[PDB]
Design an enzyme around this catalytic site. Structure first.
Site, PDB file in Angstrom:
ATOM      1  N   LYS A 110     -10.992   0.341  -0.986  1.00 22.17           N
ATOM      2  CA  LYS A 110     -11.289   1.346  -2.051  1.00 22.17           C
ATOM      3  C   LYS A 110     -10.229   2.440  -2.055  1.00 22.17           C
ATOM      4  CE  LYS A 110     -13.958  -1.321  -3.457  1.00 22.17           C
ATOM      5  NZ  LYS A 110     -15.417  -1.443  -3.677  1.00 22.17           N
ATOM      6  N   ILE A 117      -7.264   7.632  -3.407  1.00 26.01           N
ATOM      7  CA  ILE A 117      -8.624   7.023  -3.392  1.00 26.01           C
ATOM      8  C   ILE A 117      -8.779   6.206  -4.672  1.00 26.01           C
ATOM      9  CG2 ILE A 117      -9.655   8.796  -1.940  1.00 26.01           C
ATOM     10  CD1 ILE A 117     -11.059   9.965  -4.369  1.00 26.01           C
ATOM     11  N   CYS A 118      -9.604   5.173  -4.601  1.00 26.72           N
ATOM     12  CA  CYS A 118      -9.886   4.285  -5.746  1.00 26.72           C
ATOM     13  C   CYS A 118     -11.321   4.510  -6.213  1.00 26.72           C
ATOM     14  CB  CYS A 118      -9.659   2.836  -5.380  1.00 26.72           C
ATOM     15  SG  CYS A 118      -9.817   1.818  -6.852  1.00 26.72           S
ATOM     16  N   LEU A 119     -11.468   5.200  -7.346  1.00 26.43           N
ATOM     17  CA  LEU A 119     -12.785   5.558  -7.918  1.00 26.43           C
ATOM     18  C   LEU A 119     -13.294   4.361  -8.729  1.00 26.43           C
ATOM     19  CD1 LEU A 119     -11.964   9.203  -9.135  1.00 26.43           C
ATOM     20  CD2 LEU A 119     -12.826   8.425  -6.911  1.00 26.43           C
TER      21      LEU A 119
END
Length: 167
Positions: A110, A117-119
């Site tokens: 993620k 960060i990967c939302l």
């Protein structure tokens, strides 16, 4: 009547709303957007304290184009501290910044390589819906906050991240 609309309102209703359409190159209009950003952020921190959820500190460079600080996340009463940073994009605030948590680079799916960060796909349309009313306080409340509340418990359970013992 949407669950989404009510969920967002419950999170952000006491965060001061931002007004000015200005990014880093926009001179006196940017200085104005920075006052709105600082006013919103500090109120969010004060609300967070009254709610026993004082979960981050941020500061910026002079020009307010580079942001950095710490977030804290509590799990089984142990408090984990992560260094955070982001750039303000040239097309802010229509475009949303990308939070990095560099220390977690390579430790979760993620996250993009390099520590951004990967939302979930729901963050970006929610930001776009609200331009330019949302700012850095909202990015933390709606972006980094929910990310930590899934990823951190996962990484602790997988023994990927360990608690720094301290006095």
């Amino acid at each position: 009547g949407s669950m989404a609309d009510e969920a967002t309102r419950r999170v952000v209703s006491e965060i001061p709303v931002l007004k000015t359409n200005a990014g880093p190159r926009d001179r006196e209009l940017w200085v104005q957007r920075l006052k709105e950003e600082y006013q919103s952020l500090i109120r969010y921190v004060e609300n967070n304290k009254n709610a026993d959820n004082d979960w981050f500190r941020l500061e910026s460079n002079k020009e307010g184009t580079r942001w950095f600080g710490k977030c804290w996340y509590i799990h089984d009463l142990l408090k984990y501290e992560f260094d955070i940073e982001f750039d303000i994009p040239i097309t802010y605030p229509t475009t949303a910044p990308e939070i990095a948590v560099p220390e977690l680079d390579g430790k979760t799916a993620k996250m993009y390589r390099g520590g951004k960060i990967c939302l979930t796909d729901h963050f970006k349309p929610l930001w776009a819906r609200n331009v330019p009313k949302f700012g850095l306080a909202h990015l933390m409340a709606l972006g980094l906050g929910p990310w930590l509340a899934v990823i951190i418990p996962d990484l602790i359970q997988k023994g990927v991240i360990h608690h720094k013992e301290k006095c």
